[PDB]
Amino acid sequence: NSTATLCLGHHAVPNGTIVKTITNDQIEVTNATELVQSSSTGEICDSPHQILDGKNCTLIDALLGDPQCDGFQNKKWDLFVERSKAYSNCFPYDVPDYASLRSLVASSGTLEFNNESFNWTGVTQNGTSSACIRRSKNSFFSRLNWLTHLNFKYPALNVTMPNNEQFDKLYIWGVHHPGTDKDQIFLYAQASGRITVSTKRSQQTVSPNIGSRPRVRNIPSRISIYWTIVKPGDILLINSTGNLIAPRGYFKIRSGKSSIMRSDAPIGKCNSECITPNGSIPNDKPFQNVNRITYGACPRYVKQNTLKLATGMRNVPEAIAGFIENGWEGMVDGWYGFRHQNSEGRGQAADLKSTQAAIDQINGKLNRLIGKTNEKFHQIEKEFSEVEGRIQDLEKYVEDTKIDLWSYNAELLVALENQHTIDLTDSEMNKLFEKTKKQLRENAEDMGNGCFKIYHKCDNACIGSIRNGTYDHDVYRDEALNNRFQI
Amino acid sequence: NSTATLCLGHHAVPNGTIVKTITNDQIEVTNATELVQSSSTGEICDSPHQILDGKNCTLIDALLGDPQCDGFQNKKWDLFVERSKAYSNCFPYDVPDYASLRSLVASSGTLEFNNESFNWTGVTQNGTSSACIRRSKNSFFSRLNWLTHLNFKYPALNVTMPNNEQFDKLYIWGVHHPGTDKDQIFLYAQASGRITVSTKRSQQTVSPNIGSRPRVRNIPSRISIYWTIVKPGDILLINSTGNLIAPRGYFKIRSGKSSIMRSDAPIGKCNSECITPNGSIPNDKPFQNVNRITYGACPRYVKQNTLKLATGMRNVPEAIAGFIENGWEGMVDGWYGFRHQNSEGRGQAADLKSTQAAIDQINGKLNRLIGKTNEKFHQIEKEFSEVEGRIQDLEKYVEDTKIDLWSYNAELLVALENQHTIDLTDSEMNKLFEKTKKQLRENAEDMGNGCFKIYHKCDNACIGSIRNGTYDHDVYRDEALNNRFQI
Amino acid sequence: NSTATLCLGHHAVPNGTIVKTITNDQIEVTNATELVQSSSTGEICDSPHQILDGKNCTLIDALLGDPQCDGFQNKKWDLFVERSKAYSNCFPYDVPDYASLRSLVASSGTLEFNNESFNWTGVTQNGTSSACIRRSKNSFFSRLNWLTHLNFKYPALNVTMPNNEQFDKLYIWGVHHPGTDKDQIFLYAQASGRITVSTKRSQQTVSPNIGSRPRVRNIPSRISIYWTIVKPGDILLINSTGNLIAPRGYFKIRSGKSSIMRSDAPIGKCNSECITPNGSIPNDKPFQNVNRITYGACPRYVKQNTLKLATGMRNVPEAIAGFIENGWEGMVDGWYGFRHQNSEGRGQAADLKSTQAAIDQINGKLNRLIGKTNEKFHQIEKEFSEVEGRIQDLEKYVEDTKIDLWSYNAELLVALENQHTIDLTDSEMNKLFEKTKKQLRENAEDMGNGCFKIYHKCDNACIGSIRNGTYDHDVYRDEALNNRFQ
Ligand SMILES: *[C@@H]1O[C@H](CO)[C@@H](O[C@@H]2O[C@H](CO)[C@@H](O)[C@H](O)[C@H]2NC(C)=O)[C@H](O)[C@H]1NC(C)=O
Ligand SMILES: *[C@@H]1O[C@H](CO)[C@@H](O[C@@H]2O[C@H](CO)[C@@H](O)[C@H](O)[C@H]2NC(C)=O)[C@H](O)[C@H]1NC(C)=O
Ligand SMILES: *[C@@H]1O[C@H](CO)[C@@H](O[C@@H]2O[C@H](CO)[C@@H](O)[C@H](O)[C@H]2NC(C)=O)[C@H](O)[C@H]1NC(C)=O
Ligand SMILES: *[C@@H]1O[C@H](CO)[C@@H](O)[C@H](O)[C@H]1NC(C)=O
Ligand SMILES: *[C@@H]1O[C@H](CO)[C@@H](O)[C@H](O)[C@H]1NC(C)=O
Ligand SMILES: *[C@@H]1O[C@H](CO)[C@@H](O)[C@H](O)[C@H]1NC(C)=O
Ligand SMILES: *[C@@H]1O[C@H](CO)[C@@H](O)[C@H](O)[C@H]1NC(C)=O
Ligand SMILES: *[C@@H]1O[C@H](CO)[C@@H](O)[C@H](O)[C@H]1NC(C)=O
Ligand SMILES: *[C@@H]1O[C@H](CO)[C@@H](O)[C@H](O)[C@H]1NC(C)=O
Ligand SMILES: *[C@@H]1O[C@H](CO)[C@@H](O)[C@H](O)[C@H]1NC(C)=O
Ligand SMILES: *[C@@H]1O[C@H](CO)[C@@H](O)[C@H](O)[C@H]1NC(C)=O
Ligand SMILES: *[C@@H]1O[C@H](CO)[C@@H](O)[C@H](O)[C@H]1NC(C)=O
Ligand SMILES: *[C@@H]1O[C@H](CO)[C@@H](O)[C@H](O)[C@H]1NC(C)=O
Ligand SMILES: *[C@@H]1O[C@H](CO)[C@@H](O)[C@H](O)[C@H]1NC(C)=O
Ligand SMILES: *[C@@H]1O[C@H](CO)[C@@H](O)[C@H](O)[C@H]1NC(C)=O
Ligand SMILES: *[C@@H]1O[C@H](CO)[C@@H](O)[C@H](O)[C@H]1NC(C)=O
């Protein structure tokens, strides 16, 4: 006729996604991305990190060098994987402050061991046990030297070794606690006092405790594992009258990106930075709900099973009408656009610049959230198999506090960002609407349903000029004014 | 007259509330709710949590079986409330890691004790002390067995108890430290000794220390309390030559929701999810400022004394003027509405759909904040009476860090939620204004004071349609245009 | 011309600052302020906190009374500064929980020492060492009494010291660990033994461990340092057969604002609340990147080297365009303003009320961020010279968690405040535009670039009336309608 209808609107999808916001908990959007990694590959990836498979060994067993760990001598790792099927198959032993030695070795990142010419004069070296079978013969820990009497004599040892290198030396040693007095006399030829291992900086004094223990692998005795770190310029001094499980040398202490993880997952052929006890995970998402123990460039752990970030706007599912009444399910070329009813027929076109502006802002948001990872290697233990008390309670409290704070941050971030995304895309729809209103000047009226009523004959070329920003309102001003106001 | 005025606006109150926002610290709102629970009932509510009243007992005193704790034997609790007037009136004891045992048992949640038939031979059982009286006779702890010599001999005990059940067993035992050597010879007929309690996984060795102590209840001697946890399939082996305060059995270890709290509040008939040492508190508010220690489904502790969440718009108290100039004290039916001037007279009506939309958004926000609590059962100690050093400093650092972070989160959350509340209620007022503008089309002009001047004769029927919606601008369009655009 | 052009706009600068927002991490603004203190003065200000310069003394050496530390006796501090050049010149010693004793003394805030009439009968007092030279004489720690023996006898000392005052008493004592049995007999006349120090509530029992150790200052023996806290109403019993490095009295324990810091910076004659190991820092900014170790009213430590807070608007660089197309680089009188073209000529003026409203809201934000810092005195150790185990790992984990969470909060806060500031100044431009539209009513049209076309004669008096809100649309309505329509 003499008028045309130009409706502005946006696309819609048949099946949207439900996201959370500040105003609402369940708002439907056209599209959303998962920000919580809730699955793993089931396998640990061996690249870029050097992964040392513990097999039947724990890290401490590999440190001491019991027979099943012979293949772990002088090895390095980025992450040591300890299996729950791992077991000791050697002399029974314990480590006072086990967790500290395990953390120290895990953070050292190597079992590189240099033998030293210790002056073990007057004692018999290389003691053996039936509990440690190396190659069908009795043996002992490969990195320890079980000293016993020589010719029924064990003289008081005072053996020193300067640290003349530029690095710290880690010495692993222990105390043998025999089952009975007959074993103390049989092995050391005398009752024992104390063993003192010292440096200039510090000293450790320990005592044997002769007495029966419940048998593990048919041995009623125990070895207690102790360690010392010797700084450059410092001197190790071992003062012992018996019951000394001597070092054969030193381990290297290194600073680095190494740690230890407990996992039953197989190790595959891969390239994945983030390792969890359930296997490696992608680190594209900013958060994860796989596990709380992590290694490498990992997402933050949260308790939410899902957090969906709106990478799109509110769906608003289902004459012509604009964005105020409904979204358009028939629009697939873009996010925002125009639909019109003209004397030449009905039609539709996408507005690609507003679509790209909204997409660019969403891409900015994703670039701020996606791809930014938390690269962490050595942390505290987060699952415990024994109840010790105050220290474990504090470690659990710290981890629970961290998880509650990061879960709060993730929930607030997702709700604020989703509210921002809806306000952003409604804002972009409004910028296109005000731009069209300003371009049309007095030649059209807002009908209140997201559409403009154009009061002049506006053909397809006219509509196209409006869509791409080249509409000249002066050409049609008299016709539209004469039609709006009955001159 | 030939024209009418329709002013849009919002309600106001004589006395508002001062809240914080992003750009304004002292912004007045019509209504706000307190988000910090800063008061308590002064009593601990005994439901739904099972609460065991310590009376004159500590949890440890109840654990060993102090004469004042006969009412605690084999009992369960969800929260043990330890009293500051509690004291021991039995043999004085020293638990070398008191906090760990107190926490371990508090989280275990029961004093269930099975009297296992320990094979004590060659010794005298059921030793008593004059400092621990039951029914006017000398007694001892009911869960400990003080072993002494029999016929002036104390043979070396070697007593084995395998763990043949499916749960862990907690054995509590100790070492007697007499005040002098005469006491040790009188009780044990041994100059000294060593006590070793072993499992397959770990061992504890303790030595008695003969010497004087300050007399507590006239006793110059001490009992050192130790505990062993025996896993299923593990074995308890006790080896002693003297000074053994023997176990009478085991306590059960359970994973659960139990804990210990220090408080002096009375216990009475009530119902409250969250327990605080100042008495139980309502858990409706998201935050609290009562005490650092909590139990159950509680709000999170912050340093803020008050944080008020706006549950209404900005209060701007003060011809007809609208939301641009002031708020309306005479609007009592709703939050948003209309006032009009026509030839019939002046009037006012509330717009209930905009009011309900704003209320629904606020109620959604309240559902996000109010009623959502965090269940916290066993945590670290958060108040200390003794100066311990590094571990206490770390616990204080962790708790103050948590509180500082949650106080920041509370301040940012309240400022963001109040800024959003103001923006949302101003947005709803602006949406009603734009909606009215759209219905009026060319039949009205914005007066710049929140009011529309309607340029057709408009008397109580057109105003009704405008308030309802679906106002027909076409019928009045020629009259309004003749009044607006004629010279 | 029968019309006039009235354009609205905002100022711009030739060179702006790059800030981060929620949806744009490289957005240029007219002005910004640094919220991360990234540099120190290099000196530790001696005011308002009382600071003791350790020089060659550690806190433990000051506690025990090392001969070089005589100047620290009975002194008080709000912050003790331990130097990396510090070393001992007395008997070698080992504190089995060094960090805990150092924390107790640092938090007590004083070395006020009170001598007590201990009954050290039957033994010789005031033992000396060649490693502790005080006045060119052999000496010992001034707060410890090295008891050896009297006439080749060491009767078992059973010494009681009641606490009859209202404060906790800190007693520092030790155990000598000689390098050989001959030294044990020479000093104490009898071998082995043990030392028990106890109160009503607690007890500590230790044993000497005779044996050679690596020589420090040509001495192969060690003194172990132990301590006990005696509450009011309690009694301290020291029971020793030998090897006792006895107390001479007690140290007072106070609750307060004292702590210890490791630093090599000199002490300056200045005033600053926040002290870091690199020296004092200003405490105006909400965050810092100088050090993790803090004392006083400090900002929070973050991982960011810089965080810039927009204190301005978008710097949109460039007949009259308006705010939608670009900013106005020629504006010096304000942030928001007007430009016009009329029958007399072109001109420009600032709108000071919109400018002040935007500035007042920005100052509100600055008042919430700047000047609000957090006073902390005694915290965990955050740097370590040796690796100890799970406790050090936990302390590092806790501090790193705090830093990551505050760094997250700092980035979220800066991005939200900068996005709000941009929305704020865009909103103020929009309220000024809408306000102008409302005064003009139907006498002007929005031409789409931030300008209004006014369809009536509007001289400089008219433009001024529009600027200050006195414009009356009724008097110009017939001319503007005749020119605007037909
Ligand atoms: C203390 O008791 C334990 C167990 O009751 C004894 O250990 C047992 O020794 C026998 C010796 O033939 C072994 O067959 C068992 O397997 C051992 N069991 C356990 C649990 O260790 C131990 O020998 C006893 N000690 C003394 C000195 O009599
Ligand atoms: C070591 O000295 C203490 C002094 O405290 C003696 O303990 C006091 O003994 C008397 C009499 O037995 C009591 O009246 C006091 O109450 C005790 N003191 C305290 C603080 O309780 C202790 O007897 C002495 N030891 C020896 C072996 O003589
Ligand atoms: C234990 O061995 C150490 C190491 O040789 C002895 O200490 C040395 O003693 C000589 C004696 O003049 C000194 O010159 C050295 O400087 C000492 N070296 C160190 C590292 O301390 C120590 O004397 C020996 N102890 C016994 C009892 O034989
Ligand atoms: C959602 O976005 C992703 C990534 O851009 C795209 O692959 C997917 O097809 C989108 N889905 C819908 C329904 O728009
Ligand atoms: C680990 O031990 C099991 C038996 O427990 C054995 O079958 C397996 O071969 C061992 N694996 C390696 C790598 O030695
Ligand atoms: C002990 O065994 C080690 C194995 O490396 C060997 O080098 C050393 O010579 C042996 N010493 C004695 C005394 O058998
Ligand atoms: C362990 O029991 C045996 C039994 O003969 C005894 O000789 C030994 O001294 C005991 N050890 C301890 C530490 O009690
Ligand atoms: C240390 O070695 C010396 C060497 O003479 C000896 O006399 C002393 O008994 C030893 N001490 C210990 C605890 O081994
Ligand atoms: C990962 O393993 C832990 C082991 O306790 C389990 O609780 C968790 O559900 C697992 N997660 C996934 C995604 O497999
Ligand atoms: C805009 O569209 C019209 C009609 O389709 C066309 O004539 C004109 O060249 C277009 N201009 C631009 C800049 O794309
Ligand atoms: C504030 O809201 C509460 C309901 O939560 C209502 O009871 C109270 O009357 C309101 N007060 C004002 C001043 O609006
Ligand atoms: C606790 O002590 C008070 C002291 O007055 C006494 O009345 C009460 O009976 C005691 N209760 C128990 C359980 O010992
Ligand atoms: C020791 O006392 C307990 C009390 O329960 C009793 O059952 C046990 O038979 C007594 N044993 C002896 C040897 O008196
Ligand atoms: C609750 O009790 C604690 C006890 O330390 C006290 O510090 C706090 O002020 C009390 N709070 C209230 C609200 O009574
Ligand atoms: C419109 O509002 C008026 C208010 O006076 C009311 O009387 C009338 O029933 C309403 N009509 C409809 C259709 O809502
Ligand atoms: C930025 O603001 C500061 C005051 O905070 C002022 O001194 C400085 O001149 C301003 N710079 C610019 C370019 O506006």
Ligand SMILES: *[C@@H]1O[C@H](CO)[C@@H](O)[C@H](O)[C@H]1NC(C)=O
């Ligand atoms: C610190 O020690 C050095 C090296 O012995 C000495 O030169 C200096 O004078 C000492 N300073 C003080 C204050 O004791």
Ligand SMILES: *[C@@H]1O[C@H](CO)[C@@H](O)[C@H](O)[C@H]1NC(C)=O
């Ligand atoms: C020991 O030295 C102190 C000075 O610190 C002195 O007061 C005391 O009288 C001396 N005692 C003896 C027994 O010489």
Ligand SMILES: *[C@@H]1O[C@H](CO)[C@@H](O)[C@H](O)[C@H]1NC(C)=O
């Ligand atoms: C405790 O004091 C008495 C008092 O003579 C003494 O006999 C005993 O040996 C002392 N014990 C210790 C460990 O000092």
Ligand SMILES: *[C@@H]1O[C@H](CO)[C@@H](O)[C@H](O)[C@H]1NC(C)=O
């Ligand atoms: C402060 O000192 C620490 C430790 O020496 C150093 O890592 C840091 O870079 C220093 N910072 C500044 C701003 O000097």
Ligand SMILES: *[C@@H]1O[C@H](CO)[C@@H](O)[C@H](O)[C@H]1NC(C)=O
């Ligand atoms: C506004 O500006 C005009 C400029 O002509 C002046 O005459 C008038 O007095 C001013 N009014 C106010 C309130 O500043």
